[PDB]
């Protein structure tokens, strides 16, 4: 029973993370016909050809001066000096006419992605956020509608149907002819993903006794980490998104063969405070956790090693979260871990000449600090709250994180245009303010 649930968790792990590998943007520039003929005629500087063709984009303007513009010089059927063709033609190179890009650009990568295939650069750059937005919309919509399908059919036919739909959707998306169909299949599988993922957790929690809930939760975390580790290995040997999608989709097809009421928390004034503080903390932590990975997977010079190292530091977080129990109070680790995720974000915007040996350790520290805080909320939930109230609170928090994940990607991706450090100020503010609301949790007049 444990093996099946762990395999299911590991298989669900790449669904919300693979956008780092499936959709990635490489360096590109506008292409002009006839430049190849001159390059064949004159091969003095194949490398400097770019230098001799791409315009001189200035600081902070390279996003809309070399990737979305081209020169109007007629290279073909023109006599050149083979060294500086532009200098001889015109004394000043800042006065020639420009124009919109054409012919689908030219990329520099041995692999392929959705950006490379469908040309999602320049004015269409906002189409990449739809990928995550549709999946999160599916996550939100599938949470409410899963209860009805648990009745009038049974608790057995749902899992098989969800697994079959997920596998078929994955394969068909791997065989998609146009852009709209891929979005449709993403939305279609977004429901069944969480629909089948929640059942494994519920079964694992129910089957094991109350004395090993912590152990099985740690086992689930270890399974998630292992599933995250194996995905980095596959993307190393399969540099095409169709191959990678098929390779991560086929195993799903292969392996298939006087009562606690929710209205009592808002009447007594003592239980109306912590039940709001915990909700706010959970929402903030989920938003931060979702944002950090997407920020990291966009400005990395070494993606594989950074991903592996960041994923390898999530076991000590659980170890310390378990060790701190029964020895220290419940708010000191919470405050410290919430404060550790803000200082790192604040520092991460002030180290220009220290790259390649500091960003990795700072990102690891921030990731561990975020991971520690999430476990404490779950432990407090399991300690202080009854069954039914938490049985609805899990769905409520899932809906909260789903709406947070709907709103996040647009803000994260489209706020980097004004300045590259803007998304790293909101994270610092949220982290540094979430550590000041936990100090209102202790009850006043606590007699020793």
């Amino acid at each position, epitope marked *: 029973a444990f093996l099946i649930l762990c395999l299911l968790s590991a298989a669900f792990a790449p669904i919300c993370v693979g956008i780092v590998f499936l959709g990635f943007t490489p360096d590109h520039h506008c292409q002009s016909p006839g430049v190849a003929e001159l390059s064949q005629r004159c091969g003095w500087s194949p490398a400097e050809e770019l230098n001799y063709t791409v315009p001189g984009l200035g600081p902070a303007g390279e996003a809309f001066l070399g990737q979305c513009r081209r020169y109007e010089v007629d290279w073909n059927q023109s006599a050149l000096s083979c060294v500086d063709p532009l200098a001889s033609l015109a004394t000043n190179r800042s006065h020639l006419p420009l124009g919109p890009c054409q012919d689908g650009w030219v990329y520099d990568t041995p692999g392929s992605s959705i950006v490379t295939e469908f040309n999602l650069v320049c004015a269409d750059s906002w189409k990449l956020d739809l990928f995550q937005s549709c999946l999160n919309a599916g996550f939100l919509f599938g949470s409410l509608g899963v209860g009805y399908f648990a009745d009038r059919f049974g608790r057995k036919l749902c899992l098989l149907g969800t697994v079959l739909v997920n596998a078929v959707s994955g394969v068909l998306m791997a065989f998609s002819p146009n852009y709209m169909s891929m979005l449709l299949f993403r939305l279609l599988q977004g429901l069944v993903s969480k629909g089948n993922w929640m059942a494994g957790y519920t079964l694992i929690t129910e089957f094991v006794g109350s*004395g090993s809930r912590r152990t099985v939760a740690i086992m689930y975390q270890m399974a998630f980490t292992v599933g995250l580790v194996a995905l980095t290995g596959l993307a190393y040997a399969l540099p095409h998104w169709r191959w990678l999608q098929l390779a991560v989709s086929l195993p799903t097809f292969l392996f298939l063969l*006087l009562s*606690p009421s929710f209205a009592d928390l808002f009447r007594t004034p003592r239980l109306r405070k912590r039940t709001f503080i915990l909700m706010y903390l959970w929402f903030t932590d989920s938003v931060l956790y979702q944002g950090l990975i997407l920020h990291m997977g966009a400005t990395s010079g070494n993606l594989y090693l950074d991903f592996l190292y960041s994923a390898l530091v999530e076991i000590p977080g659980a170890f310390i979260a378990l060790i701190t129990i029964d020895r*220290v109070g419940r708010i000191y680790p919470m405050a410290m871990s919430n404060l550790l995720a803000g200082a790192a974000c604040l520092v991460m915007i002030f180290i220009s000449p220290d790259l390649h040996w500091l960003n990795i350790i700072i990102m690891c520290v921030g990731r561990m600090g975020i991971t520690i805080a999430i476990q404490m909320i779950c432990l407090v939930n399991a300690e202080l*709250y009854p069954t039914f109230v938490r049985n609805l609170g899990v769905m409520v928090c899932s809906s909260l994180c789903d709406i947070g994940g709907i709103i996040t990607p647009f803000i994260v991706f489209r706020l980097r245009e004004v300045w590259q450090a803007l998304p790293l100020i909101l994270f610092a503010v949220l982290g540094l303010l979430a550590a000041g609301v936990t100090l209102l949790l202790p*009850e006043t*007049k606590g*007699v*020793a």
Partner: nanobody
Amino acid sequence: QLQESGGGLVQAGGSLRLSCAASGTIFYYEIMGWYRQAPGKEREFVATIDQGGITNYADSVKGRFTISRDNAKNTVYLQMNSLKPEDTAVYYCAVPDVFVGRGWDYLIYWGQGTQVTV
């Protein structure tokens, strides 16, 4: 409102049972426990229990005391057997504070307890 029961005068440290009652709001949303007067000492700790069912114990009474929870009658039970002529104190029912201190050091509710001697 916390109220206790049980108690008596055992002859040679025999088995005895203690019961603590709750109101209904306390019984479902926080953590209960038991504390010992221990004359000559300010306060002593014995055992706890929470919603999940995980239990703690004191290093001096480990393997002799058992705590169980009853949901029908809204009560928390404690069973002591094979006592020794060293446990003569007053037993209180209390609700500790988790967020501040060490998790069992501070109290916000108590019910004046009861006295049992051996």
